[PDB]
């Protein structure tokens, strides 16, 4: 529903101290998301080189601040999509630590 982001951004404490402008939720298994770290190595949006794009399309939800959104009254727009996800990976085991973008 259109309510998804409004509820999720809140419950995930992404509206606690600020209105987190954008946030993407991935509706795939953890294993499939973690596996992206072993896939197409691409440049992060900030230029860093430890980002990886998923070979296949994943089901995601994009949460975006509405124009009337202002802390402490946050408000979001829910957008469902099926895109390749790009994440920044690090550590041992090599797993995502940042969600870069979607293409």
């Amino acid at each position: 529903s259109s309510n998804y982001c409004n509820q999720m951004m809140k419950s995930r404490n992404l509206t606690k101290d600020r209105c987190k402008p954008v946030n993407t939720f991935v509706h795939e298994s953890l294993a499939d998301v973690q596996a992206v770290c072993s896939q197409k190595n691409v440049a992060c949006k900030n230029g860093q080189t430890n980002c990886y794009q998923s070979y296949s399309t994943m089901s995601i939800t994009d949460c975006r601040e509405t124009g009337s959104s202002k802390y402490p009254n946050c408000a979001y727009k829910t957008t469902q999509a099926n895109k390749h996800i790009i994440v920044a990976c690090e550590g041992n085991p090599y797993v995502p630590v940042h969600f870069d973008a979607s293409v």
């Binding site: 992404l14 939720f25 991935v26």
Partner: peptide
């Protein structure tokens, strides 16, 4: 026990 890896799951995972 909170790590960058767990933080990612908290923020982005929703199976």
């Amino acid at each position: 026990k909170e790590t960058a890896a767990x933080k990612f799951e908290x923020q982005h995972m929703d199976s």
